[PDB]
Amino acid sequence: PLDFTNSDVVMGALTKAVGRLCLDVTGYDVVEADETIPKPEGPYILVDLSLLTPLDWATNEVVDEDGVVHTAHNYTASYTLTAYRGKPHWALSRVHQAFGLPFLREKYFPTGSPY
């Protein structure tokens, strides 16, 4: 009964969080590397999960009611963004500054989120 959110859930939701913030700020269109499609029309951004780094020793242990153990590990995921037309350098910069705007972050990176 003491459930949680395993790695698969967090990892998959992080991509969509990045996808929505890029769309909502720059106004460009977004696409991932997971499946290939004919190149869209107009400016757009490509998202890729290039790399992932672990941290060696677990930081917390949560014991189920029956004794099962849930272990928590810190990680760091790196995303490679590429913008393909228009003023791509301007587009990426506005993504950077978005993380400094308080209200905009709260939509997608609420306090207590796992990333």
Binding site: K16, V30, P38
Partner: protein, 142 residues
């Protein structure tokens, strides 16, 4: 204008082959991406008459079974002459490249994806040449 080539041959045997058109669609309701959960829609059809031939050389990339660090992978290809029009993919659209089903070196049957299409707009006769590459085993291409 061309007359003889504007009619079907009567010495070399020709066969018909099966094909299928391909589109794609987005399925995820909330994902902000054009990709979403991609799906492909098919609509079958056939080619009027075709001729199939294999690659002529023995270059390392044209061999059938190839040794990789994982295991003896599989590869096949062909050159096809046909009187039906087949299309490649076009950008900014939802259309993908046509595919057609042909026999392989392993004794089975698999789908080949059109990669290069040759046309002679100034001549008029509808005779085309295609170059095909077998879909990776265990998938439906891209």
């Amino acid at each position: 204008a061309y007359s003889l080539l504007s009619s079907r041959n009567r010495l070399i045997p020709r066969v018909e082959v099966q094909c299928r058109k391909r589109e794609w669609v987005k399925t995820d309701p909330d994902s902000p991406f054009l990709n979403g959960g991609r799906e492909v829609l098919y609509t079958p059809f056939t080619a009027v008459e075709c001729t199939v031939q294999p690659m002529r050389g023995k270059a390392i990339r044209d061999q059938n079974n190839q040794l990789m660090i994982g295991g003896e992978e599989d590869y096949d290809s062909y050159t096809v002459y046909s009187e039906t029009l087949l299309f490649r993919a076009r950008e900014g659209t939802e259309h993908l490249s046509d595919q057609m089903l042909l026999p392989d070196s392993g004794g089975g049957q698999t789908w080949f994806t059109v990669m290069k299409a040759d046309m002679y707009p100034s001549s008029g006769v509808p005779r085309y040449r295609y170059y095909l590459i077998a879909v990776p085993v265990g998938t439906e291409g891209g």
